[PDB]
């Protein structure tokens, strides 16, 4: 009574942060189990760092506005959520950004710590219409796991922050989208087997093969107790 | 009488249970009608048709 | 007639109607998303319908 | 990395077959994942023992009718497919069932060996009616997993098959029904932990703690190929 160990035959790297990790052949009814387990772990359990809290002077809430800018404060918060940050040592870093003049302010303008770096320096955050426009923010970079929205964040928190502290969502997990496709493979005896094709696309700080390896490491560490 | 029989048998009176997806573990967003149907097997066999 | 006959029929149509229809206050109404990939991530995580 | 590890805490057998087994504690978002994965593995690939060949004396094919018994020989083969047994030591045993006189032929009348334990001594196989009636079958119990039918076995049998071996289909898996539950775990400093309550229902042969440990062994063996090779 011995199972059928798979053999990794293909990693078709579409882009610098894309992958098609074909893994054939598995037992009948195991590709769905492995794919669903890895998808749930990567979507709601993989740890990472993300922008969580931002304080911008001149505005009081997300329904307000600012002068001297093209986009609004809602699109500013959206572009700040889309930022991909890595923090190595600590788990709560406060970052500042001050820019004046005509030009698209990017992620290469902000201050960086020794363990805090940005993997997309060309990430556009906002723009300025006025030469005298001075946009200022204080960006708090937390560290968690999974995904917590601002609605359940304000419903779980209870302290009264100073008004002007904007709540943005937290993209804690580094994988942006993973979708598995279970095909049907063939060994010459057993034609009823299958084949797992994981299409994973992440943001920076993590390569997709390392993401799947860390997810499998997390599931193995969770299962580690009741083994032979 | 059908709903009275369903309320006797300790079942949901609407006839539909909350089916979980066996493939991925998640719950279907709507209640799905479950119940026993008397299925036949006709005499048109694919061994004789192919 | 010059219309496509390779068309979704009754099951793909029911699925796509249930996708692109909208309720009033279902789950997680009124957020802002970075795009289609984050919308798919929200649904398959279960924080939004 | 603030993960916690689960442990088998309570194993309560409500019946001899139905046996609820808990798992505690699990992080938020891991109860449903581990519960669904363990349910799929335990329903698909649990190794057990089942009846594979039956050789009734004086009987050529399954569609015959023996004199003395009430049940047809196809009904005897179905009642023997429904037999539950647990072979301890070997992987291929041969049982013997000799019975005469008037009365039902229960499963407890099988002359078991030193390492074959029948778990259901009320499984009625036959119904002997005549006083001079007798039945002497040589049941063969193999060991495997899954469902191996008679057509697959006669396709994989390159050697000859004699006349008399009524080939019974093989349902090896001893797990018939299983459902988990993700409750709220009671931990004195964390309120965001969820326990897993697996409400198994076996054939009476397998051990539930051995079933969960074998399922986790299969899952870890499958994830070794994900950890190692990229």
Curated annotation (Swiss-Prot), chain A:
UniProt entry keywords in alphabetical sequence: Acetylation, ADP-ribosylation, DNA-directed RNA polymerase, Nucleotidyltransferase, Transcription, Transferase
Region spans: Required for interaction with Crp at class II promoters: 157-160
Keyword Acyltransferase: no
GO cellular component, one term: cytoplasm
Acyltransferase as UniProt keyword: no
GO molecular function list: DNA binding; DNA-directed RNA polymerase activity; protein dimerization activity
EC number: 2.7.7.6
EC category name: transferase
Region annotation Alpha N-terminal domain (alpha-NTD): where it falls in the sequence: 1-228
Any single GO BP term: bacterial-type flagellum assembly
UniProt similarity note: Belongs to the RNA polymerase alpha chain family.
Quaternary assembly: Homodimer. The RNAP catalytic core consists of 2 alpha, 1 beta, 1 beta' and 1 omega subunit. When a sigma factor is associated with the core the holoenzyme is formed, which can initiate transcription. Both the N- and C-terminus interact with different regions of transcriptional regulator CRP. The rRNA transcription and antitermination complex (rrnTAC) consists of RNAP, NusA, NusB, NusE (rpsJ), NusG, SubB, ribosomal protein S4, DNA and precursor rRNA; S4 is more flexible than other subunits.
Biological role stated in the UniProt entry: DNA-dependent RNA polymerase (RNAP) catalyzes the transcription of DNA into RNA using the four ribonucleoside triphosphates as substrates. This subunit plays an important role in subunit assembly since its dimerization is the first step in the sequential assembly of subunits to form the holoenzyme.
Protein name: DNA-directed RNA polymerase subunit alpha
Lineage: Bacteria, Pseudomonadati, Pseudomonadota, Gammaproteobacteria, Enterobacterales
Name of the gene this protein is made from: rpoA
Curated annotation (Swiss-Prot), chain B:
Practical application: Co-administration of salinamide and rifampicin or salinamide and myxopyronin suppresses the emergence of resistance to both antibiotics.
Post-translational modification: Acetylated on several lysine residues in the presence of glucose.
Record PTM N6-acetyllysine, positions in chain: 7
Subunit structure: The RNAP catalytic core consists of 2 alpha, 1 beta, 1 beta' and 1 omega subunit. When a sigma factor is associated with the core the holoenzyme is formed, which can initiate transcription. The rRNA transcription and antitermination complex (rrnTAC) consists of RNAP, NusA, NusB, NusE (rpsJ), NusG, SubB, ribosomal protein S4, DNA and precursor rRNA; S4 is more flexible than other subunits. In pull-down experiments interacts with CedA.
Family: Belongs to the RNA polymerase beta chain family.
Job description of the protein: DNA-dependent RNA polymerase (RNAP) catalyzes the transcription of DNA into RNA using the four ribonucleoside triphosphates as substrates. Resistance to the antibiotics salinamide A, salinamide B, rifampicin, streptolydigin, CBR703, myxopyronin, and lipiarmycin can result from mutations in this protein.
Protein's recorded name: DNA-directed RNA polymerase subunit beta
High-level lineage: Bacteria, Pseudomonadati, Pseudomonadota, Gammaproteobacteria, Enterobacterales
From Swiss-Prot, chain C:
Biotech use: Co-administration of salinamide and rifampicin or salinamide and myxopyronin suppresses the emergence of resistance to both antibiotics.
Effect listed in the UniProt record for changing residue 10 to P: Resistant to antibiotics salinamide A and B
PTM field: Acetylated on several lysine residues in the presence of glucose.
Coiled coil: none
Quaternary assembly: The RNAP catalytic core consists of 2 alpha, 1 beta, 1 beta' and 1 omega subunit. When a sigma factor is associated with the core the holoenzyme is formed, which can initiate transcription. The rRNA transcription and antitermination complex (rrnTAC) consists of RNAP, NusA, NusB, NusE (rpsJ), NusG, SubB, ribosomal protein S4, DNA and precursor rRNA; S4 is more flexible than other subunits.
Function (record text): DNA-dependent RNA polymerase (RNAP) catalyzes the transcription of DNA into RNA using the four ribonucleoside triphosphates as substrates. Resistance to the antibiotics salinamide A, salinamide B, rifampicin, streptolydigin, CBR703, myxopyronin, and lipiarmycin can result from mutations in this protein.
Family under the similarity heading: Belongs to the RNA polymerase beta' chain family.
Protein's recorded name: DNA-directed RNA polymerase subunit beta'
